[PDB]
Each structure stands twice: as structure tokens, then as C-alpha cells.
């Protein structure tokens, strides 16, 4: 029996520097309690919809570091191994991804990145813990996970896959760049690569806005006013007035247009200083010496960005990065961030956390495929940074898109926010929360499986716009384009007909 194989499995595990905490049979329909999950992760449970054997481990990665590692080995197994990854500066195992991919038949692992919780404080004075976050946590879970898969199933595994977004997107690219043989297929969303500069750019928003109530700051109401004017200026460039900017690279908005006139209600317009703030927010971050560090925030992400990036407080992840790693001073004042700090951080680049190597020929040579996607109203990580990486790879590898298409495809997703949510057709199946069925035509993960196992490369990636979230009726779908193409509404038929659009 499958249960009996699982209850007998702890005795079969004997791996150096791996301590088995427990092995449990978890039937489908179980609502797992996760009492030990770090409180800052904000998840104490996970529904597991299909039978798995659950293995939980503590794996020492050095004499002063360890990861927590979970492996969920499904009863209904397809012969495919998969690793998940992390979010933010967190060690949070993404149990929602473990449920998702195990439920699709993958032998699945996820590790906590080498520490517990969403704070960067565990990096403080602990280079081995930081090294786990940069590269060694994900890789260790792949090595151990593959071992466990082969121990548990007579058939072993035929192919190996990666699924992650945000920090998880970065970790997918760290795999491509440093461990070209870890995965046959890598699915990496909205990647936090160019990571050091991402922290600097996150930190620089405070220097532009200033604190809540200052001259230079905009309230959430004013960011809503600003959003509506951005749509007036840009929504229709793609040919459809649908509240979505299909490719914001064509949107260069001019916000002096909504500077207050005499006799205008001050709550519906900007002062000159506020307009200057907005112009700078849609400008790139350049460093000492006048070199580019991070591209502009793409227009369209204003409502959620007002709460997270433009809220008049220093962004927390970057403050943590500068206090605990760059300067090792927990009292470092993040309100006084300057580009001189960004130079110090970029030169430090610990364990090449930048994850910005543009020569990925070793991955190509090993036979790997990578599919990356990025939402074009992303409020946390600008979609333009993925576009910059693409240019850099083409330039460095000295090949055009037709050649890159053989092993590296990048889809730009209209109306998607950071990793999930947004105003438009974000339902591409990168996570349970974006799921529109399991079939490759509707699901990015299964599309990678098809590319790897049948040699069928995805031309576009379909997403759903839901009436009221995943599981509700699909209102419309759209076939998102493969960069450098963009989507343009041509008709015939209304913009809700996916056939009325063309990638151009
Ligand atoms: C980090 O969090 C994990 C839980 O996600 C902790 O692992 C648990 O620790 C206790 C105490 O050793 C074990 O008895 C449990 O079986 C563990 N749970 C799992 C899922 O493995 C881990 O201890 C924490 N790491 C620390 C504090 O270093
Ligand atoms: C699982 O349990 C938690 C409480 O621990 C609850 O919030 C969640 O809705 C449950 N899920 C289902 C679908 O029963
Ligand atoms: C701990 O590990 C470090 C880093 O790998 C190593 O150089 C050092 O010798 C070790 N110290 C002990 C106490 O084992
Ligand atoms: C701004 O607009 C969004 C819809 O895009 C709305 O849900 C939100 O409540 C508005 N925010 C404020 C502060 O009015
Ligand atoms: C300006 O707008 C607010 C709504 O934001 C309204 O309550 C207030 O009465 C208006 N003031 C004037 C002078 O029109
Ligand atoms: C196209 O569909 C949208 C979505 O409901 C709607 O706003 C619009 O009226 C439709 N256009 C026509 C011509 O029916
Ligand atoms: C990190 O080093 C590099 C940066 C670039 C950047 C090009 C650009 O930023 O416009 C190009 C090649 C490099 O080796
Ligand atoms: Ca539009």
C-alpha cells in the first residue's frame, strides 16, 4: 500500500547532514496544520487536495547554517521532480506551491532559504545563512529531493522542473546561471535578479516622495488620480480602451497635465512638486559615475504601488538589506539612502546575489529550457528589468531572438500585478491563485512540461481574467506575447475575444 510505503519510509532515509523530523501520510482533503510555521509568514495551514507522503527535514548546510526542507511525494506520480522557491527576504516555505505541484503529480520540494521569517535579520553576522538564501538552499533541496524521489519510486524521475516567482524567479535564474544541470525546465516569474540594484531602487523611492505629509509626497487618493490620467494618456495606445496598458514600454506619460489650475479642488490634482515626484518615479535609477542601476517603474502599477513603494516609509526589505548585510548596523537610517550607498552595495555583491550573469550558454548546452514571465503592472519589481535582462543576454551571447527562442522564452503579461492579481488576464497557472485548469494551453507549468518532454515550444501564453478570482467564471482570455513582441487589438470582434488581438 501507498500508506504503508510512506510509514515505512523514515527507516529507508539515511543521508549525511540530514535529520528527518517526521514522515507522515497525508490523504487528499487534509487541511494541514502548520503550528511551527514562522509567524511572520502569515500561514498556519494548507489544504492538500491529493494523497502525498510528507517528509520534513532539517539539513545542515555548514556548521553554522541549516535549512528546513519539505518533500511531498504524491501517490498519483507522473515521473517528474520539481523544486519550488521563496518570496521577499523570507524563509517561508511556499506550502501553497507544494500543494499545487504535488496535486499535479510532481514529486515536490521546498526549503525555507536558510532561515525562518520575512525579516533579513537572520543574515546579520551570518554569511552562511546569507549564502543559503543566495544559492545553496534551493540547490541543497534539489540534491536531497532527487535522492528521496529515487528512493521512494522504483521508476525514479525522467525530468526535473523548477517553479518560482519574485525571489523565487531569481532563484530559478540562479539555477540557470550557476547550476545548469539542476533542471531540465525552469519556470521563473517576475524575477528579483539584478537583486542588489533592486534593493537600491526600492530604497530610492523614499528619497523621491519624502515622508507622509511632505511637499514631495502624494496620498493614495492622488495616486489614484494619477493612475486615471496615466490610463487616459496610455490605455488606448494598444487599440483597446479596457483600463489596461498592453505594453507600457510605449507609455511615457506627461503628468504636468494634471497640475492644479486656479480654482481646482486640491484633492484632484498635483502641485508642481508632486508632478516632479511622479516624473522621477517613472525615471530610472543611475549610480555614481552615471551608470544605469535599475530601470524605471513601468506606468500602470500605481494603486498597489502607492501602498507598498510610495507610502512615505523606507521600503523594509531594502532597509534590512542595508542594515544587516551592507553596513552591519541595525540603526542605519534608511531615510538617508543615497547613490553612494548603492555603489557600496553593488561592489559588495555577496555570493553574487546580483544573479545577473547574461551568458547562459552553459544552460543552453546542457539542454535546459527556461520560460520567464513578468506582469506589466507589477508594483514590486518593474517589468522593465526583465526586458533589460533580455537585451543583455542577446548582446552578450551575440544572438537574436530567433536563436534565444530555442532555450529562453520571455512572455510579457498584460494586466498582471506582482506574480498574481491585477486588472486583466493574469490567470496563467503559475500558482493555484492564478489557475485556469491543468492543460498546457492554459497553464505555464504544464506548457514547460510539454516543451521539455514533447519538444513543443510555447508561442504565446494564455491567461484568464476571472469574474471574481480563480474558480469563478472566466470572463475572457488573452494570448500574451513572446518578447520582443507586443499585443495589439485589431478586431474583428470585441477586445474580450482573444482572436481579436495579434502579437506584433
Ligand atoms: C524554522 O521553522 C521550522 C518550521 O517550519 C522549524 O522546524 C520544526 O522544528 C521542531 C523543533 O526542532 C521540529 O520538532 C519540527 O518537526 C519542525 N517542523 C518541520 C516542518 O520540520 C525549525 O526548527 C525552525 N528553525 C530554526 C528555529 O532554526
Ligand atoms: C483550513 O483551515 C484553516 C483554519 O486552520 C481555514 O482558515 C481554512 O479556510 C481551511 N480551508 C478549508 C478549505 O477548509
Ligand atoms: C565551520 O565552517 C567554516 C565555513 O565552512 C569552516 O571554515 C570552519 O573550519 C568550521 N568551524 C568549525 C567549528 O567546524
Ligand atoms: C483607488 O482605486 C482602486 C481601484 O483601482 C480602489 O479599489 C481603491 O479603493 C482606491 N483607493 C483609494 C485610496 O481611494
Ligand atoms: C474637494 O474635494 C473633496 C473630496 O475629495 C470634497 O469633500 C470637498 O468639499 C471639495 N472642496 C471644494 C472646495 O470643492
Ligand atoms: C466589449 O466588452 C466590454 C466588456 O464588457 C464592454 O465594456 C463593451 O461595451 C463591449 N463593446 C461592445 C461594442 O459591445
Ligand atoms: C554587470 O555587468 C554588465 C552590465 C551590463 C549592462 C548594460 C547596461 O546596464 O545597460 C552589460 C554587460 C555587463 O557585463
Ligand atoms: Ca488598453
125 is catalytic: no
Q: Which residue in 160, 166, 382, 420 is the catalytic one?
A: 166
What is the H or E stretch that residue 391 is in?
helix 383-397
> Could you say which DSSP state residue 500 is in?
G
Dig out the grid coordinates for 311 from the structure: 507610502
Give the phi and the psi of residue 420 in degrees, each rounded to 5: -160, 170
The bound ligand whose nearest atom lies closest to the alpha carbon of 46 is 2
Ligand 2 pocket mutation pick from 26, 31, 99 by most atoms within 8 angstroms of CB: 31
Q: Which residue in 378, 382, 383, 420 is the catalytic one?
A: 378
Report the distance separating Cα 245 and Cα 261, nearest Å. Answer: 28
132 annotated ligand-binding residue: no
Report the distance separating Cα 375 and Cα 87, nearest Å. Answer: 16
CA-nearest residue for atom 4, ligand 6, is: 496
Report the distance separating Cα 194 and Cα 363, nearest Å. Answer: 19
Query: Three-state DSSP class for 159?
Result: strand
Give the phi and the psi of residue 392 in degrees, each rounded to 5: -65, -40
Q: Where does ligand 7 bind, in terms of residues with CB under 6 Å?
A: 292, 356, 392
> If you count DSSP H runs as helices and E runs as strands, how many of each does the chain have, helices first?
15, 17
Dig out the grid coordinates for 90 from the structure: 523570507
Rounded distance from Cα 244 to ligand 8 centre (Å)? 4
378 is catalytic: yes
- 487599440: which residue's cell? 239
240 annotated ligand-binding residue: yes
- The verdict on the CB of residue 62 being under 6 Å from ligand 3 is yes
Dig out the grid coordinates for 171 from the structure: 532563484
User: 299, 316, 118, 302: which is closest to 206 by C-alpha?
Assistant: 316
Report the distance separating Cα 87 and Cα 485, nearest Å. Answer: 29
Query: Three-state DSSP class for 279?
Result: helix
Spatial contact of 209 and 226, defined as CB atoms under 8 Å apart? no
Which atom of ligand 6 lies at the shortest distance from residue 496's CA?
2
User: 387, 385, 287, 299: which is closest to 338 by C-alpha?
Assistant: 287
The bound ligand whose nearest atom lies closest to the alpha carbon of 295 is 7
- The verdict on the CB of residue 20 being under 6 Å from ligand 1 is no
Preceding peptide of 458 cis, ω within 30°: no
Spatial contact of 174 and 134, defined as CB atoms under 8 Å apart? yes
Complete DSSP assignment for 289-357: GG-EEEPPPPTT-HHHHHHHTSSSS--HHHHHHIIIIIS--TT--GGG--HHHHHHHHHH-GGGTT---
Report the distance separating Cα 43 and Cα 55, nearest Å. Answer: 19
- The verdict on the CB of residue 366 being under 6 Å from ligand 1 is no
Rounded distance from Cα 407 to ligand 1 centre (Å)? 38
Neighbours of 171 (CB within 10 A): 30
Q: Phi/psi zone of residue 429: left (φ > 0), alpha (ψ -120 to 50 degrees), beta? A: left
Spatial contact of 150 and 160, defined as CB atoms under 8 Å apart? no
Which atom of ligand 5 lies at the shortest distance from residue 265's CA?
1
**Within its chain, how far is the Cα of 157 from the centroid?**
26
Q: Hey, what's the torsion of the CAs at 375, 379, 383, 386, to 10 degrees?
A: -110
CA-nearest residue for atom 14, ligand 2, is: 31
Complete DSSP assignment for 198-249: HHHHHHHHHHHH-STTSTT---HHHHHHHHHHHHHHHGGGGS--SS--S-GG
List C-alpha distances in Å: 347 to 144, 343, 354, 496: 33, 6, 10, 48
Report the distance separating Cα 374 and Cα 168, nearest Å. Answer: 13
Report the distance separating Cα 475 and Cα 379, nearest Å. Answer: 24
Report the distance separating Cα 408 and Cα 370, nearest Å. Answer: 5
283 is catalytic: no
* Method in brief: X-ray
Rounded distance from Cα 394 to ligand 7 centre (Å)? 12
Query: Three-state DSSP class for 43?
Result: coil
Instruction: State the chain's maximal CA–CA distance in angstroms.
Output: 79
Rounded distance from Cα 68 to ligand 1 centre (Å)? 7
Ligand 7 pocket mutation pick from 289, 352, 358, 397 by most atoms within 8 angstroms of CB: 358
Q: Residue 150 burial by CB count (10 A; 0-12/13-18/19+): exposed, middle or buried?
A: middle
Taking the CA atoms of 446, 452, 455 and 457 in sequence, report the sign of the dihedral they define.
positive
List C-alpha distances in Å: 420 to 407, 425, 495: 25, 10, 22
What is the H or E stretch that residue 109 is in?
strand 107-111
> Could you say which DSSP state residue 433 is in?
G
CA-nearest residue for atom 4, ligand 5, is: 267
Report the distance separating Cα 219 and Cα 250, nearest Å. Answer: 26
Rounded distance from Cα 267 to ligand 4 centre (Å)? 14
Q: Which residue in 414, 418, 420, 480 is the catalytic one?
A: 418
Neighbours of 401 (CB within 10 A): 15
- The verdict on the CB of residue 221 being under 6 Å from ligand 4 is yes
Dig out the grid coordinates for 300 from the structure: 500602470
- The verdict on the CB of residue 21 being under 6 Å from ligand 1 is yes
Dig out the grid coordinates for 284 from the structure: 530610472
Report the distance separating Cα 503 and Cα 479, nearest Å. Answer: 9
Report the distance separating Cα 438 and Cα 446, nearest Å. Answer: 7
359 annotated ligand-binding residue: no
Chain breaks in the chain following residues, C–N > 2.5 Å? none
Give the phi and the psi of residue 393 in degrees, each rounded to 5: -65, -45
User: 376, 373, 368, 22: which is closest to 178 by C-alpha?
Assistant: 368
Spatial contact of 225 and 303, defined as CB atoms under 8 Å apart? no
Query: Three-state DSSP class for 146?
Result: helix
Which atom of ligand 4 lies at the shortest distance from residue 220's CA?
13
Q: Phi/psi zone of residue 415: left (φ > 0), alpha (ψ -120 to 50 degrees), beta? A: left
CA-nearest residue for atom 3, ligand 2, is: 45
Dig out the grid coordinates for 219 from the structure: 496620498
Dig out the grid coordinates for 91 from the structure: 524563509
Q: What is the CA radius of gyration of the chain?
A: 23
Contacts of 424 (CB under 8 A, 6+ apart): 242, 243, 244, 377, 414, 415, 416, 463, 465, 478
Spatial contact of 416 and 376, defined as CB atoms under 8 Å apart? yes
The β-bridge relationship of strands 185-189 and 369-375 is: parallel
| Side-chain-side CA neighbours of residue 12 (13 Å) | 15
Helices 167-178 and 137-152: crossing angle, nearest 10°?
80
Amino acid at each position: 500500500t501507498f500508506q504503508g510505503k510512506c510509514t515505512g519510509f523514515a527507516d529507508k532515509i539515511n543521508l549525511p547532514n540530514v535529520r528527518v523530523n517526521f514522515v507522515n501520510y497525508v490523504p487528499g482533503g487534509t487541511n494541514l496544520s502548520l503550528p511551527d510555521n514562522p509567524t511572520s509568514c502569515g500561514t498556519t495551514s494548507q489544504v492538500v487536495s491529493e494523497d502525498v507522503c510528507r517528509i520534513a527535514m532539517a539539513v545542515a548546510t555548514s556548521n553554522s547554517s541549516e535549512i528546513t526542507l519539505e518533500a511531498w511525494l504524491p501517490q498519483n506520480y507522473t515521473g517528474r521532480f520539481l523544486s519550488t522557491g521563496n518570496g521577499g527576504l523570507s524563509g517561508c516555505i511556499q506550502y501553497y506551491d507544494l500543494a499545487y505541484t504535488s496535486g499535479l503529480g510532481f514529486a515536490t520540494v521546498g526549503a525555507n532559504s536558510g532561515h525562518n521569517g520575512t525579516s533579513g535579520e537572520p543574515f546579520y553576522h551570518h554569511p552562511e545563512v546569507l549564502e543559503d538564501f543566495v544559492h545553496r538552499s534551493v540547490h541543497t533541496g534539489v540534491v536531497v529531493g532527487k535522492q528521496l524521489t529515487k528512493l521512494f519510486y522504483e521508476e525514479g524521475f525522467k525530468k526535473s522542473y523548477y517553479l518560482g516567482c519574485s525571489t523565487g524567479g531569481r532563484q530559478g535564474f540562479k539555477s540557470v546561471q550557476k547550476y545548469p544541470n539542476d533542471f531540465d525546465g525552469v519556470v521563473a516569474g517576475a524575477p528579483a535578479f539584478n537583486m542588489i540594484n533592486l534593493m537600491s531602487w526600492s530604497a530610492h523611492f523614499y528619497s523621491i516622495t519624502g515622508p507622509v505629509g511632505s511637499d514631495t509626497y502624494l496620498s493614495p487618493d492622488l495616486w489614484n488620480i494619477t493612475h486615471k490620467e496615466i490610463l487616459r494618456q496610455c490605455d488606448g495606445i494598444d487599440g483597446a480602451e479596457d483600463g489596461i496598458i498592453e505594453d507600457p514600454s510605449l507609455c511615457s506619460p506627461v503628468l504636468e497635465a494634471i497640475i492644479c489650475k486656479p480654482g481646482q479642488n486640491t484633492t484632484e490634482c498635483l502641485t508642481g512638486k508632486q508632478a516632479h515626484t511622479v516624473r522621477e518615479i517613472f525615471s530610472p535609477l543611475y549610480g555614481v559615475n552615471g551608470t544605469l542601476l535599475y530601470p524605471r517603474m513601468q506606468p500602470g502599477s500605481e494603486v498597489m504601488a502607492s501602498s507598498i513603494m510610495y507610502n512615505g516609509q523606507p521600503f523594509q526589505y531594502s532597509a534590512d538589506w542595508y542594515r544587516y548585510v551592507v553596513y552591519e548596523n541595525p540603526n542605519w537610517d534608511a531615510t538617508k539612502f543615497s547613490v553612494r550607498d548603492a555603489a557600496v552595495a553593488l561592489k559588495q555583491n555577496p555570493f553574487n546575489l546580483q544573479t545577473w550573469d547574461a551568458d547562459i550558454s552553459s544552460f543552453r548546452k546542457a539542454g535546459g529550457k527556461v520560460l520567464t514571465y513578468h506582469g506589466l503592472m507589477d508594483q514590486l519589481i518593474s517589468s522593465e528589468n526583465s526586458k533589460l535582462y533580455y537585451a543583455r543576454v542577446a548582446e552578450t551571447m551575440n544572438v537574436p531572438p530567433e536563436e534565444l527562442d530555442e532555450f529562453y522564452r520571455f512572455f510579457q503579461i498584460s494586466g498582471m500585478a506582482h506574480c498574481s492579481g491585477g486588472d486583466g488576464a493574469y490567470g496563467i497557472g503559475n500558482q493555484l491563485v492564478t489557475y485556469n485548469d491543468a492543460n498546457p494551453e492554459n497553464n505555464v507549468l504544464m506548457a514547460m512540461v510539454q516543451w521539455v518532454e514533447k519538444g513543443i515550444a510555447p508561442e504565446t501564453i494564455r491567461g484568464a481574467k476571472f469574474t471574481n478570482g480563480t474558480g469563478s467564471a472566466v470572463e475572457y482570455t488573452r494570448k500574451h506575447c513572446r518578447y520582443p513582441r507586443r499585443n495589439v487589438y485589431k478586431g474583428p470582434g470585441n477586445y474580450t475575444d482573444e482572436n481579436a488581438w495579434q502579437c506584433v
